[PDB]
Point group: D2
C-alpha cells in the first residue's frame, strides 16, 4: 500500500514505488525551501512487516540537486507506514546541508512530515 | 571519494558505491542491535557539491531485513562527506521501528555516526 | 500568553508559569512511558519576542525522577509558542535514557509534541 | 560529578550547578551562532542514577536572549553524564527559532555536543 502519490502537510508531493525486493523509488517535490520541480528519491522498507498491528518501517533520501537547481543538501525521512481507512506515512526527517567544518554545528535541520494520499 | 569501505566508531562497516547519477548503493553490517551479516543500502548524495570548502551532503537508508533475520525497522543516515587525509562521513541518524500507533511516540531512536576509511 | 495549562496530543499535561525574566517553571504529567504522576520542569523562553508575527522560542527539561518512580531518563522539548485563534506550543523533543557505554548508540528517542490550551 | 566547568567540542563553555533537588543552574556561552557572552541556562538531571555503570540522564535549556542581544531562539541539550575515566557529558540538542507558521518547517536545528572538563 506504500506505492502511490502522497502529500505532506507542507503540501509537498511524494511519488513512490515499493519493489518486492524491499526497495523504494520515486520523486519528491517540495512545497518549500531551496527547491524546484522534482528530485529523485531512493530508500528501503520492510517487505515483511510484523502482523501484530505494527506499522511498516521505511526510509528514503533526497539529495536536493536536479536539472534546475542544487541546494547542496540532502533530506532523509525515517518513519513507518500505517495502514487502515486513511493510510498515512508518519516520519521524522534530517535535512543536512553541506557546510564548512566551522559551520557543521548548524548543518542539520530536523522536523516531521505526515503524508496522506489526499 | 565516497566509494569504498567505511568504518563507524561503533564498529559497524558500511560498503558503498557512489554512482555518477547521485546514487549510493551497497551493504551495511551492524556491530550492534538486532542485526546479522550484511544488509542492503540505498541512498543519495550531492554529485556536484559547492567549492567554498563545504562537505558533500548525502543520506542513505537500511531496512534491517536480510537472509538471516528481520528486525522490523529501518535506519536513515543523513549527513555529509568531508574529504582529506582523514576523510570522514559525519552523520546523524534516525532509526524507526514499526510500532502500534499507541507506541508510535517511542518509535524512533536518534543518534550520530562518524565514519572513517 | 504562555502561562497556564497546556495539553499534548499524546494526552500529556504541561503546566507552566512564564516569568517576566524568561524563566519557565511548572510540572509535566506524561500519558506514556515509565512515568507516574507529575514531574518538575524547568526551562527558558524568549521574553522579548519579535513583533513580525514570529512565534516565541522556548524550551524545557524534565528528568523522569519524582517521589514515586525513577526512569533514569530525561526529556527536553524545544519549540515555539504561537498566539492567536488557538494558541499553541509546537515542539520537538529528545529523550535520553541512562545507558552503559556499549549501549549508548540506543540511548535517545526523538519525537514531536504539539500543545494546545484545549 | 556534574557540577563544574564543562567545554563542548565546539569551544562553548557550560558552567553548571547541580542542586540536591535535581536542578541544573548556570550560564552557557556559545563559541558559535547568534550569541555573545553569557546566557542563563536551567535544566534537570537524575539525582538517583542507576549503579550498574549506566550513565546519568540530564538536560537543560538556553533562550538566546541576554542584555546584549536577542536571537529569538532556544536550545535544549538532552544527554547523559558518564563518570570515571575522562568523565564527560554526551548530548544531542534541539535549537528552535521563533518563526512564522509558513517557515516553521525550518525552525529547528539538531546536533550533538560532547562535553568534557578539559
Ligand atoms: O531548502 C533545501 O535545502 C532543499 C528543500 C528541502 C525542503 C524540506 S525537506 C523536509 C521538508 N519536507 C518537505 O516536503 N519539504 C521540506
Ligand atoms: O536493531 C535493529 O533494529 C537493527 C540494527 C540497528 C543498528 C544501528 S543503526 C544506527 C547505529 N549505527 C550502526 O552502525 N549500528 C546502529
Ligand atoms: O519512559 C521514560 O523514561 C519517561 C518518558 C516520559 C514520556 C515521554 S517524554 C516525550 C513524550 N511526550 C510526552 O508527553 N510523553 C512522552
Ligand atoms: O544562533 C542562535 O540562535 C543562538 C546561538 C546558538 C549556538 C548553538 S546551541 C547548539 C550548539 N552548541 C553550542 O555550544 N553552540 C551551538
Amino acid at each position: 500500500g506504500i506505492t502511490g502519490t502522497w502529500y505532506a502537510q507542507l503540501g509537498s508531493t511524494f511519488i513512490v514505488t515499493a519493489g518486492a525486493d524491499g526497495a523504494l523509488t520515486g520523486t519528491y517535490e517540495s512545497a518549500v525551501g531551496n527547491a524546484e520541480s522534482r528530485y529523485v528519491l531512493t530508500g528501503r522498507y520492510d517487505s515483511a512487516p510484523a502482523t501484530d498491528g505494527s506499522g511498516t518501517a521505511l526510509g528514503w533520501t533526497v539529495a536536493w540537486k536536479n536539472n534546475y537547481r542544487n541546494a547542496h543538501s540532502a533530506t532523509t525521512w525515517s518513519g513507518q507506514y500505517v495502514g487502515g481507512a486513511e493510510a498515512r506515512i508518519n516520519t521524522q526527517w534530517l535535512l543536512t546541508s553541506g557546510t564548512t567544518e566551522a559551520n557543521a554545528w548548524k548543518s542539520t535541520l530536523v522536523g516531521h512530515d505526515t503524508f496522506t494520499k489526499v
